[PDB]
Structures are given as structure tokens and as C-alpha cells.
Amino acid sequence: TRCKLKLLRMERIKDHLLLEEEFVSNSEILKPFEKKQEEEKKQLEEIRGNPLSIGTLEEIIDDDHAIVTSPTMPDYYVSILSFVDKELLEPGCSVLLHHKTMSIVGVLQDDADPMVSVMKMDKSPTESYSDIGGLESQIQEIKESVELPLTHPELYEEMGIKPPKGVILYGAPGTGKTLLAKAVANQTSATFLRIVGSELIQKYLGDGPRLCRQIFKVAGENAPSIVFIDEIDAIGTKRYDSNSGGEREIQRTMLELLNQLDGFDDRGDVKVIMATNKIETLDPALIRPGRIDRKILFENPDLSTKKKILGIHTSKMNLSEDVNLETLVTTKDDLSGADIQAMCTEAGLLALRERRMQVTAEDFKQAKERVMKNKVEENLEGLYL
């Protein structure tokens, strides 16, 4: 009771003050200036018409022009002029054009696009510094590769080695490979990119290779970063369709991904994470070792590892005096970490079933037998016996 009040003491006053502070300041900003900056703004608005057609800058020719490719079907030789500089632009950046006669009138985007919006996230990570136990060892391998160059680059220099680039998490479902990456990201306090690899692909053609570029482009602006491209399996060796409407799309999109990962330089400052079911849903060579270090094979919790996962859950639920910690383990045979969480959800539903406010002995025992029954084989001991 006393400490949840202390969270309230810290959060209510500081946070409530912060809203109020923003709200007055929006007025207050205006008042210091009354000419010069106001004037320049005023003529920016006369110059720039309403609406503005979006552009994408392909390239700058150094003579006060450029070439843009726009969602308007023909391309344009546009000029660079009015409240924009030649060096305020870089190629491949998104520009704002004048409706009447296309001209770069400045930038207020700088790689602002919807695919950027999905990718950047302001969400809170689900796990923070391995909240849920088990897989102690595997995290002390992600950390060596990913977290460790960011935190201390010096140690690699004494060693005289180049620092790693990226990790590949793979193997079993229900082992929380996608959640360890979230843990590592919160530990450092890095920039995290939840983009999903499957969100670049659509029926419509020719859109995809833009999207692959934009990932590497944004990641480098906000570096240091951790990039997670989750579920790069779907864009693997496989094909969209066996008829039509996708013969090209997977082929261009994957190839284009390998290229801009290597083309950065061999960096140890923008890490990638590829989350994949297996290497049998991807191409047999990726990009392909010395360059992609390290590879982490997830396999099923062992008796030690699954104990650890379980102890977390059971303590957050009523009672444990009824059926010993050991007696849960003993009854269970080795399975993924989802099966361990599943037994506890079912146990809780069973306490509801009885209409108890205690997880009784009976509830534990049934919940254990249920999961084992899904998920079953018996010809391991049938070949034998």
C-alpha cells in the first residue's frame, strides 16, 4: 500500500506539471519576437502555395536544379530555390513541391513516410532485463554481440578485432526469441525498430524495393540503433504465387535487403536482428558468414530452465503451499516456455470454474495433464516398449 503511494508521489506531481508547462509555453514562444523571423515566415507562406504536391528527390544536379520522381506520373526537372539550400538536401530525401510549377521549396519531412511510422515505435518494451526467467546463457550471447559494442567500444580496440554486426535468432516457437531482443533493447536504452519484414510486401508491384532502402536510411540518421526486422522468413526463398501477381516482388525485395546491410560498411553501431522460423524457410546462403555474427539456436527449456520460467508465474497467483514447486516440474516433461505459461492460465480458469480465490491442489493437477495432451507423442516409448 505504501510503495504504490510512493509511485503516485513521483509520477502525479512531475507528470501533471509537464502537461501544464507545455500548454502555457506554446503561447509564450510567440511573444519574444515581433519582426525579422515573423517577416521571413510571412513571405515563405506567400511563396508556398496551397496544397503542396509531395516529391521524392532522386538526385541533385549542381547548377540550381534537380530531378525528382513524384507520385505524378512523369518526372520533373525541378529547380532548388527559395528557403532551401543545395546542402540542406541530400539525395533520396523527401522534398515538398509547389503545385503550380514544381520547385523544391524546402523540406519539413526528412525521411517522413508511413513505412517509417510503422517502424519507429514509442511503445514500452514488454520485458525489461529478462523479467521472465530461463534462457540465461542465450542472452549472454546476444549481449556479447549487440549490447556490448554499443556500451563499450574500447574493449574491442585493445583486442584489435572488428566489432560484430547483427544477430540471427532462430529455431523453436514459444521460446521468446522475439522477447529477448526487446529485453536487450530496453537494457541499453537504444532506438528500437519494430519493423516486420512482411509489411513491405503487397500484391501491387514495384513499391517494395523503396521500403527496403528506407529502413537502412532512417536507422542510420538515428544511430545508435537496434534494428529488428521480425519474420524475414516470408520474404525468403519461397514464391508469392504460382500464377501471377507476385513473380517479381519477393525476388527484388530480399536481394535489395542484403545489399544495403553490407553497403553501410561493416559497422558495429547499427545492429540488425533477423527473426526467422528456420534457415529452411530462407535461402541456403544469406550474406553469409564473418559478417552476420552470431547465430543463436533456440531449443526447448531443460528441467533447470523450465523451473525458472515457472517460479515467476506461480508466485504472482494465489498459494504455492498446496503443491510443492518441485511437484510441478516432476509431473511435466520437457516442452517450450509457452507450455509452461499455458498450464498457469488454465490453472487460473479452473479456480474460476470452482469459484475459488485460491489456486487449490486440484487446479494444479488438471492444468498439468491438459497441456501434455495437445502436443503429444508416445511412440518414443512405444518403439522402446
Binding site: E199, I201, Q202, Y204
Partner: protein, 51 residues
């Protein structure tokens, strides 16, 4: 009907609706719709005679 939840019901695999966008991205929009109009039950179909 009794829970006082949304319905939809999604019949089969999604590609079929294209009237605006494509059916690949209506899966992405499954989130946006489910949440705003929560409380929802979604009866997602796919019999799997695909096999």
C-alpha cells in the same frame, strides 16, 4: 450476441476484398478495427481444407 461484443466473422482467407486497398493489409487493420470498437469477438474462419 450475449457478451455484447462486435461481430465479424471473417469468412476464409483474405485477399478477396480490394474495393479499397488489398486483403493482405486488412489483416494489419484487424488490430486497428478490433481495438477501437472493443469489446470484440472475432470468429476468424479458415476450415483448412487447404490441408
Amino acid at each position: 450476441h450475449h457478451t455484447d461484443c462486435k461481430f465479424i466473422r471473417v469468412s476464409g482467407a483474405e485477399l478477396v476484398q480490394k474495393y479499397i486497398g488489398e486483403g493482405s493489409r486488412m489483416v494489419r487493420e484487424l488490430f486497428v478495427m478490433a481495438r477501437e470498437h472493443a469489446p470484440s469477438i472475432i470468429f476468424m474462419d479458415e476450415i483448412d481444407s487447404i490441408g
